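Bug #2210: token dump truncated for NowGFP?
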Amino acid sequence: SVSKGEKLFTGVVPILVELDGDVNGHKFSVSGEGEGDATYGKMSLKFICTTGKLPVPWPTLKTTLMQCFARYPDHMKQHDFFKSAMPEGYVQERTIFFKDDGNYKTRAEVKFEGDTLVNRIELKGVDFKEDGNILGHKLEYNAISGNANITADKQKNGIKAYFTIRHDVEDGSVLLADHYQQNTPIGDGPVLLPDNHYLSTQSKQSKDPNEKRDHMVLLEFVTAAGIPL
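Reproduced locally. Full output below:
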């Protein structure tokens, strides 16, 4: 027996995201909603800080706030761990090390609740500088793109990923955010353990002009690559 989780993604899937965060004791929550269309690698999303002003920059939360919506080429479909874990889902854990600043540790469960793909997340950040580029809100609000490298993790029946995001800082410098990721299935069914490959993300990031809450609107396109036909 093999998984049939990928069949859950052939159409447009509603998305719901919930995050509770605590960075240097500053607590906050974020909710998000939108839709995923994995056939085209697409997600349309809007996130809102439900506790008032977000105490860290939106760009620092982007990667934390659903690699199951990636478009895998037909010739790479046997390497799509993320959909194979569905509907029971996966746990996604990261540590994100911000160069010369603190780190985020995140734990998420990504799974279906009925027809909705839900991403529930805890985030804890420690050791940040109150006057640094993060807690001081010195990061440009601009889209991020680029690659997430994926490798099998057979010992955990899952995957690992690694990549670094280069956040633009308002002084023209770059803040490097070194990501280390581990995903494990929640259910006990069959999963796909991939050969090495990457996910490439193209993003367009905006504000809703009528929205008074602190928020972020994204249009993301994510494609698997790195294995030749």
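Output looks complete on our side. The domain at 1-229 is CATH 2.40.155.10 (Green Fluorescent Protein). Marking as cannot-reproduce; reopen if the truncation happens again.
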